[PDB]
Amino acid sequence: MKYLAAYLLLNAAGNTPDATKIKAILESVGIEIEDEKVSSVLSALEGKSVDELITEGN
Amino acid sequence: MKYLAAYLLLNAAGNTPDATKIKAILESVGIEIEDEKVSSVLSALEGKSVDELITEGN
Amino acid sequence: SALSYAALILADSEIEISSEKLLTLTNAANVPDENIWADIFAKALDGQNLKDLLVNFS
Amino acid sequence: SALSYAALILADSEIEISSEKLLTLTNAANVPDENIWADIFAKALDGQNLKDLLVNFS
Amino acid sequence: LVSHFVSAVSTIASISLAIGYPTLPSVGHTLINNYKDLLAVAIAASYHY
Incomplete structure (x- = not known):
């Protein structure tokens, strides 16, 4: 989706x-x-470690 | 189905x-x-833990 | 989520997933209406095959 | 990768993955343009089903 | 009904993961989709980074 890719790219x-x-x-x-x-x-993003969520792949 | 979604939503x-x-x-x-x-x-719902049934996903 | 469960019941019943229809099911549940959350939800659901998404998933 | 995330957002938005379109999203992010990397990206993406690749993967 | 519940639960869960609509259960998966799709573009192609 648009949103997901946009924050990921940033x-x-x-x-x-x-x-x-x-x-x-x-x-x-x-x-x-x-x-x-x-x-x-x-x-949803607040207080989340984006890097840790990536480290498991699903 | 109608019923399933309705009780889940509640x-x-x-x-x-x-x-x-x-x-x-x-x-x-x-x-x-x-x-x-x-x-x-x-x-069917009586005496069931809905949260536990969700925890395995099927 | 109450909003996701409301969408699946609305599609099962055969009724469109819009702000009025989500609001009526949400009110019957007793959960307060929040404009931003049902608006995102209708917007996320726009341009979707509900049927095709519903089935795959890990 | 900023370049991979830029491609998936451009396809989700419905816009073609070319040098101009990647460059505008890349500039909005604030990341400097590098000619080799986006040229390379378009070239890998040429002749592709973005949809078919996106789903399988180990 | 358990099977139907679990399947209904998966419909909700599915909708949640794919849709990106972040109350408590869905969230970590929704973030992962935006990768799943990038990591992914690499596997077919033949640029190496």
Whole structure:
């Protein structure tokens, strides 16, 4: 999906947030972002170690 | 199915019974409930740990 | 999730997964309506084969 | 990889995976453009079913 | 009904994993999809990084 790839791509570069980057990447794609989908992904992201979740593969 | 999703949805909220909720959700769907199907699901539900059955996934 | 369970019941009943229809099942459950979460949910579900997603999964 | 994540978001958004489209998402991320890496990426992605590759994998 | 429950539970679970809609159960899997798909593009191709 759009959201998933966008935050993952940023994570590789090493940094992310609502307006500054998530909104910027999807907008660079040329797509209009749904705020609710960004908010949900960010709220889920808080207090999570993205690198650890990757280390098991599923 | 209708019944399965309805009790599951309630379980997430954390509470359920014949008239009070099962009947209420399906009626909120706009569908007429068969009593026999509700009765069967409830009778099956008694003395079961729904959370434990979920923990194996099948 | 109450929102995911609400979607699967709405499709099983044969009714479209929109803000009104999710809101009526959600209200029957007794869980408070939150605009952002059902809005993301309808948006995530947009452009989907519910049937094809439902079956594979590890 | 930022380049792999950029490709999956571009396909999810519905936009073609070419040098301009990867460059705009890459710039929005803030990562510097490198001609060799995105050219390479388009070339690997040429002649591909993105959908068929995405699902199997050990 | 146990089989149907577990299958219903999987429908929800499936919907959750694939859809990306992060209350408590789904979340770690949803993140993994965005990789599963990248790691993946590598296996067919023939650029080495």
